[PDB]
Amino acid sequence: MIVWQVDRMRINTWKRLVKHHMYISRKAKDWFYRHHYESTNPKISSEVHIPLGDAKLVITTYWGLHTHLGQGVSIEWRKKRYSTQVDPDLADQLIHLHYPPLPSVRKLTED
Amino acid sequence: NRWQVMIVWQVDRMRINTWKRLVKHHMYISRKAKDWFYRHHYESTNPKISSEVHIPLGDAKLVITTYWGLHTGERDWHLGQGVSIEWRKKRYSTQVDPDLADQLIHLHYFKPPLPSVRKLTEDRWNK
Amino acid sequence: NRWQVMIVWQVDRMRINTWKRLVKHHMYISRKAKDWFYRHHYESTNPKISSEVHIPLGDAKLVITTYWGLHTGERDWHLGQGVSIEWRKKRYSTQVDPDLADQLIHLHYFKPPLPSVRKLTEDRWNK
Amino acid sequence: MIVWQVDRMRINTWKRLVKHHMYISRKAKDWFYRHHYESTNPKISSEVHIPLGDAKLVITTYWGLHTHLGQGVSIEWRKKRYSTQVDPDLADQLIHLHYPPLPSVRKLTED
Amino acid sequence: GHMDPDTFSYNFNNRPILSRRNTVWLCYEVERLDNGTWVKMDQHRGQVYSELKYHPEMRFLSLVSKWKLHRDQEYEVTWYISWSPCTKCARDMATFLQENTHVTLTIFVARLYYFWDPDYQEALRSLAQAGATIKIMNYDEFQHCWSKFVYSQGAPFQPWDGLDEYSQALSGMLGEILRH
Amino acid sequence: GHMDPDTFSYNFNNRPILSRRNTVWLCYEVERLDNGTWVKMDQHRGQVYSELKYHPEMRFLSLVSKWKLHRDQEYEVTWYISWSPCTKCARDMATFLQENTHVTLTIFVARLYYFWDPDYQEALRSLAQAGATIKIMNYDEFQHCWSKFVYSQGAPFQPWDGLDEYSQALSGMLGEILRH
Amino acid sequence: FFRKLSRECEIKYTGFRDRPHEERQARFQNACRDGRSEIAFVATGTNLSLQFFPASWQREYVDLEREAGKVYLKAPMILNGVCVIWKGWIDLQRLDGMGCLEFD
Amino acid sequence: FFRKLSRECEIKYTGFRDRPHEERQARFQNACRDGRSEIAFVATGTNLSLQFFPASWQREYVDLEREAGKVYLKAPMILNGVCVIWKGWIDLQRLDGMGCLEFD
Amino acid sequence: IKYTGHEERQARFQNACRDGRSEIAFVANLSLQFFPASWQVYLKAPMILNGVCVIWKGWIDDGMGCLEF
Amino acid sequence: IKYTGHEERQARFQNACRDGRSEIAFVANLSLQFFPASWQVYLKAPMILNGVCVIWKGWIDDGMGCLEF
RNA sequence: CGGUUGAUUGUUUUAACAA
RNA sequence: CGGUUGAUUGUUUUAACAA
Ligand SMILES: [Zn+2]
Ligand SMILES: [Zn+2]
């Protein structure tokens, strides 16, 4: 798995914007938000599922990494059991095609 | 979609605080309104109820419920706080205007001024 | 090293503010002490003078100067504010205790209470 | 000239500690502090002269650098007209031998 | 000691998961060690609310700096806070306690803020290691705050439903976090 | 409108170089554009002091957020501040003004904070480019603040020595900074 | 008291007055679509407000289907011991309209 | 009034009570060495304070040479129309000592 | 690449690699994370990236690693 | 090394180098500063560092620079 | 560093404490 | 996202405004 080092403030802004756009703005209401307690991995902060046709794009935010504790983001395309690591550049187009500032993977992932 | 309809008089924060302090002062310090029941906000299923004052009138009760965190009003200081007054007897509730509520209070019960609903609910920003 | 010696009575911030407000109220609102001259802090070469009140007594003047940003006191609320009272005539100045200052004020000049130096300078934290 | 990129907060802490130790603490009272208006260079924030026997160690803080405006520090040993660029490691010993936390070049310069 | 009962009841509710308490209220009191006994400071106690950019811990630190406490005396500071301190607040309190060894701090929390977050766990652990005592606010300190910091006008304290159960659950969570 | 005269005289002294004014005082007033005329808001005006970690600009931003100003109305906000905003304050005010196009801001400064600092110069220039009007507080606005925000109890305003000279010098410095 | 509301009365929505008009329209549409959020209508001339709390918080309806671009509101309530109805309508764009009391 | 100060009176230095004792000693030594900083001595039993302002802020001396580890203070002043002297001494370590009024 | 986590650091690296049940980080802000399979020195890992099945192989004493299809 | 200050950036680099009266930065947080003499592409600069007279020489299109005694 | 103040020195930061 | 609230949703943040 590829994890990009990110500050906690950017993670908080990302999760706040995601919650806003699936609940209040409802522009991304089709998305799913999985909390920490629904994940078996103790290091996973949160999961964001973006439905893309049959497939789905999963953005997983991690906390408690020893990179002194660090946080990270992992983008992963999922076609049923099939999975693939995705760079932010591909995720930008993948989100723009099928879909407060909009929640963009590039802004959160960029250093 | 099922809705519950209540007439809420929008009142600024200062008047809400003055009403609450006057009622609590007359409940414990100057025990003239010692029969009034003050139910706190956590005893109501409505998430936007700040306070609830019960005034026993005979076998019925006049309930004055103050709400916080409501929608903003037209005026500058109507920031989401209001007051609704009703009269209930045997699970039959009817909304009551502040003047009638004050008349009932003076009929059944009647220096820091006495708590009056008319002064609390009057709009000083629209006149 | 040349020094200037002054007896400063340490007084908390609340009493300083009360004294200033009472003096200013009696200078302009209730003009009984209308002859008192209030010189501000920027008119004194001393960098640690907060205020200066001049009270004309005959051909002399009783000067009450309040200081801020002094050294901390022994008590908790002696945070660096104090008051010093003196009597000056023809460039001859002598320090005056608060009781004598109040006696002079009542001899020459004499609801919000009248400004008294004894109440301002009295230590409520040491008794 | 060698200039190390530093945040403005570290520069403020350095100047505050220097002023403290030459005025109130008086542990470094022999030092000299040259302000902005006594320097011909418009980019110089401040100068700190540390007398080291006959020689002197000059620590010059710069602002307004286009590195978007950046600040920097330059350490320079001076023996009369002779001058030399000095790394923080040498300056540590040079200050410790002849002389709130103490003002250390390494802490300010380190990234 | 000027706090309306509604604010106290809303903010100091001890339910472990409370989603609409966006402000942090901190009541503070200070005691001084004189002649071997801890005498309360009547004028050195109060309560402070929170701002979006200004947390109550920073305001209390500023108040302590302004108080000019004697360095040759021992002070014991009791806190009653609705939310447990965040990472920045715990960090700053830890370094302040390290730099101020003459004052000790005990903290009662109505709720644990992000008790499942590893970052908040290490912040709380560092604050505890700095010498601060972290406790869960039970019914006794709730009544003490009601009778001391709350402008109840003589009204008796009315505990909310499930106060003891929430207190026990938060005590267990705090014990797990602090590795007792 | 509750400000003692001593605080105003000490903090709002307009000497360009003032070394012992460590706190920032900001008086604010708001006007609303109704029927083509600017009507003053009597209850939307006041004054706020500064904290070591909390600047008055952030407190004013929080107050504006709490005011719930109508987005379909035009607001004009006048500031009277002892020190010109710092880099962070100018940054935040610039982004707030960019995100709030229905409100305009005019600022009068008693003194220019670090007017020789290039960082503060670019901060002030960015704040001006964001739409804020920056002016030097002359005798007229000093008298207005004395009669409006200062609890003078009817006492007349007493200007300090060299007020006009300092005002002219600060006006020249501000004109040089803003590149008029 | 009844005559003041019955004779002349107009209502408007001011739920989020600090937000842009399009966002206000979207928020009002959402709150009317799902009965999980309160909607308040303020009389322009007074401080009186009509609040439609969800039934979970304690023949009254809010609807959009009657007319496109309009919201129709029916609220029966017992006021001062007599049952009355509140009939109102506000259009989508301006978040404004007419609302008044009648005898049922 | 005079008798209260003349009979029993003790003085102490509390200039920086929030700082460590060594820093307090250093600050007091500096302020006594150069006449650019004020020094205040507080009577323990009252709120009375004796402040030695520098002469630039408006036979009185503060000195260390009389005894090692001690500060001696002489302050003539006209109080209540009669000239009096204030004689005091405080030792370096404890920043405490004896100070009293006398007739000159 | 470089490990992010001196004697205590290398002891932790060694015992974490020998026993497992922990996460291992290798920064390049790109970083490779090694998680235990229950949560769901030479290094080799098959991973699908942008639709192709690339394999990342590397070594650490600091070290060097690269991905090849 | 790399210049810190795209078309506007290179135009500013060019005219600043041609005319002068400005500071030029070259970061490696070490950085080389070129100041006009009145304040007191190939790059060459004699400079005394740690008591020795080293000479820093480099080139920029980004670039490469090194110091040699 | 209370000064030809170059400004995070010892902050002067407070609506009623004597209504 | 006023809910088996996972917590920066529309903040509920205020010593006297009726002494
Ligand atoms: Zn916090
Ligand atoms: Zn600022």
Author numbering:
A (entry chain I), D (entry chain E): 8 to 74, 80 to 111, 161 to 172
B (entry chain G), C (entry chain C): 3 to 112, 160 to 176
E (entry chain B), F (entry chain A): -1 to 178
G (entry chain H), H (entry chain D): 17 to 74, 83 to 128
I (entry chain J), J (entry chain F): 27 to 31, 37 to 59, 63 to 74, 95 to 115, 120 to 127
From the paper:
A3G is a human, single-stranded DNA (ssDNA) deaminase that catalyzes fatal mutations in genomes of viruses such as HIV-1 [Reviewed in 6–9]. Here we show reconstitution of the A3G-Vif complex and subsequent A3G ubiquitination in vitro and report the cryo-EM structure of the A3G-Vif complex at 2.8 Å resolution using solubility-enhanced variants of A3G and Vif.
In the asymmetric unit of this sA3G-VC-RNA20 structure, a single sA3G assembles with two VCs, named VCred and VCblue. The ligand, RNA20, participates in both interfaces sA3G-Vifred and sA3G-Vifblue. Specifically, we found two dinucleotides, rG6rA7 and rC17rA18, that were well defined in protein pockets of sA3G NTD and Vifblue, respectively. Although the pocket size is large enough to accept a purine base, guanine atom O6 would be repelled by the carbonyl oxygens of P25 and L123, resulting in selective accommodation of adenine base. The cryo-EM map shows that the base rA18 is accommodated in a cavity formed by amino acids R17, T20, L24 and P162 to K168 of Vifblue including the PPLP motif. Intriguingly, only the two nucleotides, rA7 and rA18, participate in base-specific interactions with their protein binding partners.
